[PDB]
Scaffold this active site. Sequence first.
Site, mmCIF file in Angstrom:
data_model
loop_
_atom_site.group_PDB
_atom_site.id
_atom_site.type_symbol
_atom_site.label_atom_id
_atom_site.label_comp_id
_atom_site.label_asym_id
_atom_site.label_seq_id
_atom_site.Cartn_x
_atom_site.Cartn_y
_atom_site.Cartn_z
ATOM 1 N N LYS A 62 28.898 29.377 12.195
ATOM 2 C CA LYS A 62 29.730 30.115 13.147
ATOM 3 C C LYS A 62 31.164 30.282 12.649
ATOM 4 O O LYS A 62 31.705 31.396 12.629
ATOM 5 C CB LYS A 62 29.771 29.406 14.503
ATOM 6 C CG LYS A 62 28.516 29.441 15.333
ATOM 7 C CD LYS A 62 28.750 28.659 16.620
ATOM 8 C CE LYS A 62 28.122 27.286 16.575
ATOM 9 N NZ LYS A 62 28.732 26.440 15.511
ATOM 10 N N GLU A 78 37.936 22.404 18.930
ATOM 11 C CA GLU A 78 37.373 22.268 17.591
ATOM 12 C C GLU A 78 38.239 21.334 16.739
ATOM 13 O O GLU A 78 39.151 20.675 17.238
ATOM 14 C CB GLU A 78 37.190 23.643 16.955
ATOM 15 C CG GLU A 78 35.986 24.365 17.513
ATOM 16 C CD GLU A 78 34.687 23.776 17.004
ATOM 17 O OE1 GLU A 78 34.587 23.531 15.786
ATOM 18 O OE2 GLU A 78 33.767 23.548 17.821
ATOM 19 N N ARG A 79 37.919 21.265 15.446
ATOM 20 C CA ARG A 79 38.568 20.323 14.537
ATOM 21 C C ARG A 79 40.016 20.711 14.258
ATOM 22 O O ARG A 79 40.310 21.864 13.931
ATOM 23 C CB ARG A 79 37.784 20.261 13.230
ATOM 24 C CG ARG A 79 36.454 19.559 13.372
ATOM 25 C CD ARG A 79 35.770 19.419 12.031
ATOM 26 N NE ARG A 79 34.799 20.487 11.844
ATOM 27 C CZ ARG A 79 33.595 20.511 12.399
ATOM 28 N NH1 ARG A 79 33.156 19.467 13.081
ATOM 29 N NH2 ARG A 79 32.788 21.538 12.186
HETATM 30 N N1 LIG Z 1 27.944 31.998 3.179
HETATM 31 C C1 LIG Z 1 27.855 30.657 3.037
HETATM 32 N N2 LIG Z 1 27.796 30.095 1.812
HETATM 33 C C2 LIG Z 1 27.707 28.761 1.649
HETATM 34 N N3 LIG Z 1 27.666 27.889 2.668
HETATM 35 C C3 LIG Z 1 27.727 28.328 3.947
HETATM 36 C C4 LIG Z 1 27.814 29.762 4.210
HETATM 37 N N4 LIG Z 1 27.846 29.920 5.547
HETATM 38 C C5 LIG Z 1 27.775 28.680 6.092
HETATM 39 N N5 LIG Z 1 27.670 27.736 5.135
HETATM 40 C C6 LIG Z 1 27.628 26.275 5.354
HETATM 41 O O1 LIG Z 1 27.681 25.976 6.738
HETATM 42 C C7 LIG Z 1 28.301 24.703 6.877
HETATM 43 C C8 LIG Z 1 29.012 24.652 8.217
HETATM 44 O O2 LIG Z 1 29.639 25.906 8.469
HETATM 45 P P1 LIG Z 1 30.530 26.004 9.796
HETATM 46 O O3 LIG Z 1 31.081 27.398 9.966
HETATM 47 O O4 LIG Z 1 31.494 24.850 9.792
HETATM 48 O O5 LIG Z 1 29.379 25.709 10.877
HETATM 49 P P2 LIG Z 1 29.666 25.674 12.454
HETATM 50 O O6 LIG Z 1 31.122 26.039 12.587
HETATM 51 O O7 LIG Z 1 28.706 26.674 13.048
HETATM 52 O O8 LIG Z 1 29.351 24.244 12.813
HETATM 53 C C9 LIG Z 1 29.255 24.570 5.696
HETATM 54 O O9 LIG Z 1 29.039 23.344 4.999
HETATM 55 C C10 LIG Z 1 28.923 25.738 4.793
HETATM 56 O O10 LIG Z 1 28.727 25.298 3.450
HETATM 57 MG MG LIG Z 2 31.039 24.337 13.827
#
Ligand SMILES: Nc1ncnc2c1ncn2[C@@H]1O[C@H](COP(=O)(O)OP(=O)(O)O)[C@@H](O)[C@H]1O
Ligand SMILES: [Mg+2]
Lengths: 460, 460, 55, 74
Positions: free
Chosen positions: A156, A182-183
Amino acid sequence: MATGKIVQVIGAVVDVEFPQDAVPRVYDALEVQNGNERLVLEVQQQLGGGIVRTIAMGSSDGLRRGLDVKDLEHPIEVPVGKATLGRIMNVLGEPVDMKGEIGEEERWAIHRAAPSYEELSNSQELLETGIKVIDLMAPFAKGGKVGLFGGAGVGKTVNMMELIRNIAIEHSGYSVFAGVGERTREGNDFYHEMTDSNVIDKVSLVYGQMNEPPGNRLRVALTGLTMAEKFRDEGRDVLLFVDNIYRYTLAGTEVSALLGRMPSAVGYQPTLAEEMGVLQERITSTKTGSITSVQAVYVPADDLTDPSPATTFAHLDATVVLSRQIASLGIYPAVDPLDSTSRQLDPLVVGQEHYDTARGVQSILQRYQELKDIIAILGMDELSEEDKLVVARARKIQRFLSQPFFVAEVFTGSPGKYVSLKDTIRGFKGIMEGEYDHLPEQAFYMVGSIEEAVEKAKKL
Amino acid sequence: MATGKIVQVIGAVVDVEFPQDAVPRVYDALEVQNGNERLVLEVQQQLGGGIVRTIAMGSSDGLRRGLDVKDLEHPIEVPVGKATLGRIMNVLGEPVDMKGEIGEEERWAIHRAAPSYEELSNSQELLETGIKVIDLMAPFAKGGKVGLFGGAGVGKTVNMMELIRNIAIEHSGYSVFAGVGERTREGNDFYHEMTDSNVIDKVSLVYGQMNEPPGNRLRVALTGLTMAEKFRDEGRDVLLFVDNIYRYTLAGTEVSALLGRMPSAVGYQPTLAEEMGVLQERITSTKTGSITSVQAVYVPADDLTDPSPATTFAHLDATVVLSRQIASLGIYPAVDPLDSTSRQLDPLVVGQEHYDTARGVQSILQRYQELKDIIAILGMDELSEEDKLVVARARKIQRFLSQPFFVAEVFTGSPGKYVSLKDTIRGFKGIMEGEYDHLPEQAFYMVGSIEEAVEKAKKL
Amino acid sequence: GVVENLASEQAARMVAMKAATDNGGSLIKELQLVYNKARQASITQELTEIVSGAA
Amino acid sequence: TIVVVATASESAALQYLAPYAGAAMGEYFRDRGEDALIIYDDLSKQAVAYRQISLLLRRPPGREAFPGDVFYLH
Ligand SMILES: Nc1ncnc2c1ncn2[C@@H]1O[C@H](COP(=O)(O)OP(=O)(O)O)[C@@H](O)[C@H]1O
Ligand SMILES: [Mg+2]
Ligand SMILES: Nc1ncnc2c1ncn2[C@@H]1O[C@H](COP(=O)(O)OP(=O)(O)O)[C@@H](O)[C@H]1O
Ligand SMILES: [Mg+2]
């Protein structure tokens, strides 16, 4: 001056007794001297005896019962306008970066009515994003609402950061980012990305991150939306990014039981849908200005039917649904194309070629889903020589939906790619009708346009 | 003289306070003037001192605290006897057909004790319905109970209309129809079908419609039972039609939730099985007369496992299973011959000829259901020459046990047919033995006795 | 060549039905885990509604 | 067409009441001898508004916390 006294303290909620001729109204702010600090309470209910139930906009520890509290006779008000652009603010509108005071000329109450019905405006102007799946499957317009649904760790925030990069930098008007529960790490990494890209002069920031007590998380979305509404009323067009709207409802659930309200379906407050609609309905474009918004919408336990996702889905215009299964494949962006949709995916708005390409992609991905259970029991050999062709094309489509991102350039070493709408429909239309039947599946994984897949095939 | 005063109104639930000397007992009917309308209340509970907790039979709108309440020292009591025949009444025994007053001679209270096990009359006299499939596959005796299980749209209501007509102008006995949870459209269609078919003069109709308070829907089954028990006392062999037991259990759930009783396994009321027993134990044959009964049972979401159909099964003697697949094929009545059963289907009470005919029909249909997939994969020309005969004979049986109803004419225009049990056994016993291997299959579709089959083939 | 191909057909069907039986046996495990989670969630969601309804 | 609007921010009572207001307009044509057609978009949202109203009044909750009389509502 101080005219009331604390009579209870249950966690985040506080009960205050006033003379019956001076009882505050039902959204006024109150002030308490908590030790040496100053704590603000927002009143949520009027109980009968000059008592009043309030939520503490701060840490509740240290509060004795019997403290004097002071009746501010106005609601919570935040600075607003040009003065608040390159700066970070608290839920109370106080500055949280180490710079001086905010130079605002005007302050707005964060509780406001939604615009009238005759005042709304609707626009068909398609907005282009670099992201193959999002604009092919779920194209969204200027002034529309986009929502990203997913469980935990599905993508997300990385996708919202890509949308920020691809629209929000090559965009003229101001922008507002609200971090709701969030963080703080990611808020700091964002603030330093903006300041080192010299775009911070256009991005107003509000933070009520997940370390704060329930009141800050509850109100912080409303105070960020107030700043977006002020920029809308000046006649501008504005981008609003909300980094997890679900936390607003969750902070309401955490408070709800203490306010003495009978629990509902799965624990949620009885007022879940009204609490959500009172915020969601005022984030809209009008005839004087437009707000384009992207919301992340966490779904608990990956359950898309949990009341909070289910009641959120109705508000948005484009819903992108991320799924953990596809991410476990490593196919980012992990959009589920059989669940993502848009209001704008109509032939009169998008045009017939786009509409037909998107419907054909959905149709063969659904047919592959229908084959998967028989492929799981019997194995693939039993399929028809027609069925194997739609399976091979559906798998090649599932690979070609993946794309590398300029912000994911630190999780993988691959350079980011920007794919135009023309190139993505040109490639999906090419795959569907079998002109690329001879390439292997790995030729399509993490590439830009199809002319990069034909090159990757040569290097295996 | 009136001596109670209203002290609460919460929806359909009203509390009334009386002097400590005169407190109404449970199930007494109270009376109050809801403006110009006259509202009765049924006493559900004596809670606390002098207060009484009640359900309003009419709608509760317009009631106000402090109204005077007169307590009628009798339960709700209704007119009974010949005078009821061909009238429409509500739960209170007030006319709704606008034909003026009922012109009663006697009134009975709707609450009364069931017969003791010593007063019961062991009987095995089979009823003769006009319906081939029900007479053959599910015979039932006087005083027995029949449940028409099935989904929505399968033909329960029209099957009960056909039964009423056949057991009202072939055997000239009286009948009572208690529409608990009726749909006003279907109730008017029923009233006009019975008035057009000349049978109205031997049916007594009670309606509790869906737009009435819960307890008003609940009591109606007891009102119809009380009329059938008056007719039984006169020595008649009455027949009682309950239009849906599932809506009786739902009305009980609603009433129990309003009174605030703690709910049960699936949210149903705790008293579910005792309400079902108090209803179904009054429906029995006795040394003086008998009440036979047929009850429509809607199975929600297609499972026989939830508390309502699961708890009604314990009382039935015959179960007919209707299916929408067979109906969609175009065969009516849509009885599944393999899954419908009876406790009375054994050689000792139906005779060896009937038992053998029924078991042979079921065996032929089971063998055809086995052969169907070999026919589908291999094709019919591969079957053995005795199996190619089982197929044709089963296909003709499967046609012959459809039938045109007198009340379905408005759906099809074709006239109805009444088939005696002798003709039913003769027809099936002939078909299974090959006496009609020379007729087409369509010679058996929607015919009455086998004579119509031979005559249609001669015409075809 | 026809009879050798027919015996090759019977052996190939034997091996294929063996593999399909093991795939079914794995799918039973995965469905039973999902069923256990579903019935636990149903028990708790019911008993919590009952207990929280009693004021 | 007539369009009756009770948006997501309206008071729960206006959402709960809005279908009956529409029906009241449809009956005006019905009782005259004319034909009307009424669309109630999301009766489930009326049921959620009525659940909220009934839970704030401390009424006994039924299944999924809906009040007992939701059937008699619809
Ligand atoms: N296009 C991408 N390429 C590599 N890793 C991705 C990609 N999209 C998401 N990820 C992986 O998703 C993980 C968490 O993404 P994040 O946006 O923090 O998730 P959320 O916010 O939904 O919890 C990251 O460790 C990232 O490596
Ligand atoms: Mg997240
Ligand atoms: N024997 C029949 N002949 C013609 N139509 C039938 C017959 N039985 C059922 N139907 C059709 O089914 C519809 C509803 O049947 P009904 O008895 O109301 O089913 P339910 O058991 O759901 O109440 C009727 O409108 C009618 O057209
Ligand atoms: Mg029916």
